[PDB]
């Protein structure tokens, strides 16, 4: 018979629930033909199974027998495989039966699943007729439980557990091989044809992991090497089988006598006819061996395997790792001596890192010479405000509220509206630089020739030399502003640690977080954004207070003079007024804040506030006695907070509110502030590193490593 099959449409597809093991796992299965096209496969995977494209494809080929390799050698393989599958999105291609390396990887997946959370897309591609339970899985759209206990009599192998997704290729016959290789290979080609979100134009990178196998696996690896897009191949040495003999044959090439291991038919059947080509492409051989050489980490070797086979431009590799979000690998491979970064690539990389919210990659790039001064343009910031590659935010809703909801579909947000929203949040007297007429002229004359193409008809639109221009004397100020607006706390914190006038930035950030939390509470939000914004405001106030106190301990006169100057960047105020608007109890109540007021009754003032908090309510005295200390403390906080308001009321502009000094003294204060914040961070590092628990944890880790090394030393026997 030659492929004259009874061709009816398939009618069996659904879910299963595993029985027999400690994990009740649910897997998706479809039985397709052995002549099925990959197109509908990809449609089903992306649409029905809700499986977005992974940033890596892993091809695993192993023996179909029940071999065993050395314990404490497979462990590094399992750790690397789990790390690779968890850190970044990577699909796994295998059969799915409980034999060979498939059983090993199923056990590995069971190991990690008992360690941490998270899900891994495992795709079981095997022919439909192999398993014994071809029956009991005919019903469509019903969760059919599977029994993982296998009888020894049957010559049919059950499907390995801990599998995410199953795909069955019906062949017409039952229980045979040689009908799923072509479908899996074409699926790999199809995924190679797919395009990932990166603008370089990079497909899905694919690795070729080879374990155990046999003479057929030699044909498979030859196919992988000889394909027009090369498939980098990683080989497992501890297999012992044909993969391991290839690993042995890698060394000392151009003897053949040693290879005569009589695998099938002695030297009469010697496959050197194609092993010569196999060893001709030995530069792409990614060996692996535990306990020798270096870089024995499976995941790290896997990742750099696609890097030596990339052969593309270094910025392309940097973009691929940024998508992979592995800053250590970029530190290792993509950043070496002699990198010759092409012009304009670094700015694009920094832009895409900003739109992807990667603090570590951003700081690495800046440490490589990326300067936020020269990198930043108005256009870049505008594109930052109009992206979708990250978390959700209220900014569109806030704009619709402030701009009276007159928006057309998918309006492109401008900076002027951003400044209007900011001034709406800050308060009455506030006036941003964006609303200033110089910014108006710069926007209209330069950045607004015809950028809103569809808006000129609607009507929502109303140079000689330059310092490069599109330049914000203080780019990090606006960067921190934007980070706050898009609700990205960590990046905003990283920005806040750089720049100048950082305490004013912290006060502004706290006020903004409080206002945004109020806005979220005003319009039926998800009730966690509100408290998260409140926590962010708490953190900003805490940082402001800590910086103020550390600066005060550093010196008193400069710290007193610090809250005095006008803010040429923040609508021309002083830190005290901002803290008052932000309504910071302790900051106003702080020692330095109080004595700063003094340059312009202590006892019985709190006494009046004592009774006022009792007016709401021997039992009474029992309430009075047990509700007096905290009430006194809170009243002290309130009075120390309201002393400023009392002073201003009893007073009411060179002084009285502010103090004005020359630019040189402002530069001195800037250096003082930078020194203070650097000292604060270093002392925080010291205090955190000096805790006893940290020493205990470090000692425990080093003891574990030392025990492992002691066992390694005891493995050898020189006598």
């Amino acid at each position: 018979i030659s492929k004259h099959t009874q061709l009816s449409p398939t009618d069996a597809f659904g879910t299963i629930e595993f029985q027999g093991g400690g994990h009740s796992n649910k897997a998706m299965y479809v039985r397709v033909s052995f002549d099925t096209k990959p197109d509908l496969l990809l449609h089903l995977m992306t649409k029905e199974w809700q499986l977005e494209l992974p940033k890596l494809l892993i091809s695993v080929h192993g023996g179909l027998q029940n071999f065993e390799l050395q314990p404490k050698l497979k462990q590094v393989f399992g750790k690397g495989l789990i790390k690779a599958a968890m850190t970044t999105g990577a699909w796994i291609f295998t059969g799915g039966v409980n034999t060979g390396v498939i059983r090993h990887v199923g056990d590995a997946l069971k190991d990690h699943a008992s360690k941490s959370r998270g899900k891994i897309c495992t795709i079981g591609i095997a022919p439909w007729g192999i398993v014994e339970n071809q029956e009991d899985l005919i019903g469509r759209d019903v969760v059919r439980p599977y029994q993982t206990m296998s009888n020894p009599m049957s010559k049919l192998t059950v499907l390995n557990s801990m599998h995410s997704h199953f795909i069955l290729a019906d062949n017409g016959t039952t229980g045979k091989y040689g009908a799923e290789v072509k479908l899996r290979r074409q699926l790999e080609k199809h995924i190679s044809l797919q395009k990932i979100n990166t603008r370089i134009g990079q497909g899905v990178p694919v690795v070729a992991l080879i374990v155990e196998g046999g003479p057929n696996v030699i044909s498979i690896v030859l196919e992988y090497l000889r394909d027009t897009p090369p498939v980098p191949v990683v080989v497992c040495d501890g297999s012992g089988r044909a993969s391991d003999i290839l690993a042995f044959g890698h060394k000392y090439s151009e003897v053949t006598i040693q290879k005569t291991f009589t695998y099938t038919r002695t030297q009469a059947q010697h496959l050197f006819i194609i092993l010569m080509e196999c060893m001709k492409k030995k530069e792409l051989i990614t060996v692996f061996r535990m306990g020798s050489e270096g870089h024995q980490d499976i995941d790290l070797a896997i990742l750099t395997a696609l890097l030596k086979g990339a052969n593309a431009s270094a910025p392309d590799q940097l973009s691929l790792a940024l998508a992979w979000n592995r800053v250590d690998i970029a530190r290792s491979q993509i950043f070496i001596y002699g990198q010759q970064w092409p012009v304009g690539s670094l700015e694009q990389a920094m832009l895409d890192a900003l739109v992807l919210d990667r603090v570590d990659f951003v700081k690495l790039l800046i440490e490589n010479g990326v300067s936020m001064h020269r990198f930043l343009t108005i256009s870049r910031l505008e594109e930052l405000y109009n992206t979708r590659h990250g978390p959700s935010n209220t900014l569109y809703h806030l704009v619709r509220d402030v701009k009276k909801g007159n928006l057309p579909p998918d309006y492109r947000i401008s900076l002027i509206d951003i400044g209007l929203v900011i001034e709406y949040l800050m308060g009455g007297a506030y006036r941003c630089n964006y609303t200033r007429k110089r910014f108006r002229t710069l926007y209209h004359n330069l950045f607004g020739p015809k950028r809103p193409k569809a808006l000129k008809l609607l009507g929502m639109e109303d140079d000689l030399d330059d310092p490069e221009i599109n330049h914000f004397p203080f780019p990090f100020h606006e960067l921190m502003v934007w980070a706050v607006l898009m609700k990205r706390q960590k990046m905003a914190l990283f920005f806040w640690q750089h720049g100048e006038e950082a305490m004013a930035k912290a006060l502004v950030a706290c006020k903004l977080c409080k206002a945004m939390a109020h806005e979220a509470s005003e319009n039926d939000m998800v009730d966690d954004i509100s408290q998260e914004l409140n926590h962010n405001s708490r953190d900003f106030g805490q940082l402001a207070v800590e910086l103020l106190d550390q600066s005060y301990k550093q010196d008193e006169q400069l710290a007193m003079k610090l809250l005095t100057y006008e803010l040429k960047n923040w609508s021309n105020a002083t830190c005290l007024q901002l803290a008052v608007a932000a309504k910071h109890r302790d900051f106003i109540a702080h020692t330095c804040s109080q004595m700063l007021l003094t340059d312009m009754n202590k006892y019985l003032g709190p006494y009046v506030m004592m009774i006022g908090k009792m007016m709401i309510d021997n039992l009474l005295i029992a309430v009075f006695n047990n509700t007096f200390f905290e009430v006194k403390s809170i009243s002290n906080q309130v009075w120390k907070f309201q002393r400023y308001q009392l002073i201003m009321t009893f007073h009411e502009r060179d002084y009285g509110l502010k103090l004005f000094i020359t630019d040189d003294e402002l530069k001195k204060v800037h250096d003082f502030e930078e020194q203070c914040i650097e000292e604060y961070f270093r002392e925080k590092d010291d205090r955190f590193n000096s805790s006893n628990d940290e020493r205990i944890r470090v000692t425990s880790e080093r003891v574990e490593n030392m025990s492992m090394r002691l066992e390694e030393v005891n493995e050898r026997e020189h006598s």
Partner: protein, 337 residues
């Protein structure tokens, strides 16, 4: 295979080189005798008071008695022009429609804009209410301007570098005018119905011949987006309105610029332009609040017609050329004469 750019470089010569050989007696010396217009003041006749907000488009009625409202309110109000009254008012599904075409007989009305669709509405239904006949999907750029040939064939202007000619009853488009890069904001039909020159972003108009979907002539010489264009009545020329605040008159059958019609006080763009019935006195609506009765033949302004406090966008001159009617963003429409 890059010599094609050298032949295009070679073929770029003849248009200017023959022109400078031909340009011996421009319009400056032919007719210097005719006196400047001087002081002529045009009076508004009817003021359509009652609308809400900015008016974005207007096309007249083919009896010189009617026009279609297109404003920010979204109500397509069929306004009578002989009692300042209306017949029907049709709010759209989306209030962002940036054009309105009126049937050459007087039966139906096209509409489209930000929706990137064109829709034709049956005004004269038996039940007495205006209902949409069909939509015209197929444009990925917003409908900027459109005009009919008759009540079945309509030219449309789109921002996705495709100019179209839609069949109405079928709902299908037979052919597409491809070969224009700048986004076309306005289209000015030739009197033959078989030609139209359009105003686009690339500062170029094209003699797009209707029965082919093919460009005939090159009309380049402007500086920015050609936001307006009006055809000369005899069928041999057309004047344009652009963003560079200058009017640059060209010709079909000679393919040369005629003059410059610009002022030091005119810096804002030109929204809607119109000739005279003889093509003598030229009109132009601008972004600001001052129009000029220009002369495309003599660069002479009859006067300034400032009666609108808001932006001038839409206007329409009678087929018999008896008067001109201007509508602005102040929710009015005024008839200067």
């Amino acid at each position: 295979l890059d010599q094609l750019r050298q032949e295009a470089e070679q073929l770029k010569n003849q248009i200017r080189d023959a022109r400078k050989a031909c340009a011996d007696a421009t319009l400056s010396q032919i007719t210097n005798n005719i006196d400047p217009v001087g002081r002529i003041q045009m009076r508004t006749r009817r003021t359509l008071r009652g609308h809400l907000a900015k008016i974005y488009a207007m096309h007249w009625g083919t009896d010189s008695r009617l026009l279609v409202s297109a404003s920010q309110d979204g109500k397509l109000i069929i306004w009578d022009s002989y009692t300042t009254n209306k017949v029907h008012a049709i709010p759209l599904r989306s209030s962002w429609v940036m054009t309105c075409a009126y049937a050459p007989s007087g039966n139906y009305v096209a509409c489209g804009g930000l929706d990137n669709i064109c829709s034709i509405y049956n005004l004269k239904t038996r039940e007495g209410n205006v209902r949409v006949s069909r939509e015209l999907a197929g444009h990925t750029g917003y409908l900027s301007c459109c005009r009919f040939l008759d009540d079945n064939q309509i030219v449309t202007s789109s921002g996705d570098t495709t100019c179209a000619l839609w069949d109405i009853e079928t709902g299908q488009q037979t052919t597409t005018f491809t070969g224009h890069t700048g986004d076309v904001m306005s289209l000015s039909l030739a009197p033959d119905t078989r030609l139209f020159v359009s105003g686009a972003c690339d500062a170029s108009a094209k003699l797009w011949d209707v029965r082919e979907g093919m460009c005939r002539q090159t009309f380049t010489g402007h500086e920015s987006d050609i936001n307006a264009i009006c055809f000369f009545p005899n069928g041999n020329a057309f004047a344009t309105g652009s963003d560079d605040a200058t009017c640059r008159l060209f010709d079909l059958r000679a393919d040369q610029e005629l003059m410059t019609y610009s002022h030091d006080n005119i810096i804002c763009g030109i929204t809607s332009v119109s000739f005279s019935k003889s093509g003598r006195l030229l009109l132009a609506g601008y972004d600001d609040f001052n129009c000029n009765v220009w002369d495309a033949l003599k660069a002479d302004r009859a006067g300034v017609l400032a009666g609108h406090d808001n932006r001038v966008s839409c206007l329409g001159v009678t087929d018999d050329g008896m008067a001109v009617a201007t509508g602005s963003w102040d929710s009015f429409l005024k008839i200067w004469n």
